[PDB]
């Protein structure tokens, strides 16, 4: 079920950083765990490359201050031509709100237009009133 919001980039869950099989086949190179307890599930293969962003999908968790590692990482996987999945225990909101996040600043759209891309290839997103809320400081700050 992993959602391919774009060319290089891939949006998923728990049991998606465990398939291999398919992840090698879509070309994955990087891997953003959005948790912070889940393993790094594959690591010992020596396969990908991996970040992790220690959040948990709280009313009180900041992700602003992982959006830049997490865009200079998807940039690189741009500039490298491999895939990236980004994934959280299930999509839903951590990992998208970083998705929405990168969407409005490396690609050109605002919150509502990146949402609604995303929601219309992943439907189940949904950011919490919290996160919300940080993507839209984070358009005013943008468009400061």
């Known amino acids: ?43 010992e293969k020596g396969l ?18 992982y959006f830049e590692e997490a ?9 490298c031509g491999k895939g990236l999945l980004i994934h959280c225990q299930a999509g839903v909101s951590r990992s998208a709100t970083i998705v929405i996040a990168y969407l409005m600043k490396h ?3 605002t919150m509502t237009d990146a949402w609604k891309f995303v929601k219309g290839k992943r439907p189940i997103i949904s950011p919490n009133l919290n996160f919300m809320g940080q993507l839209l400081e984070f358009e005013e700050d943008l468009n400061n």
């Not at 220690?54 to 009313?59: G, K, M, R």
Request: glycine content about 2%; charged content about 20%.
């Open 1 to 43: 079920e992993l959602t391919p919001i774009l060319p290089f980039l891939f949006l998923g869950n728990e049991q998606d950083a465990q398939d291999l099989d398919t992840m090698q086949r879509l070309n994955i190179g990087y891997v953003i765990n959005v948790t912070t307890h889940l393993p790094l599930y594959h690591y």
């Open 48 to 65: 990908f490359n991996y970040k992790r962003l220690p959040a948990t999908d709280s009313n009180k968790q900041n992700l602003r201050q």
């Open 71 to 79: 865009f200079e990482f998807i940039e690189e996987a741009h500039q």
């Open 107 to 109: 690609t050109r759209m």
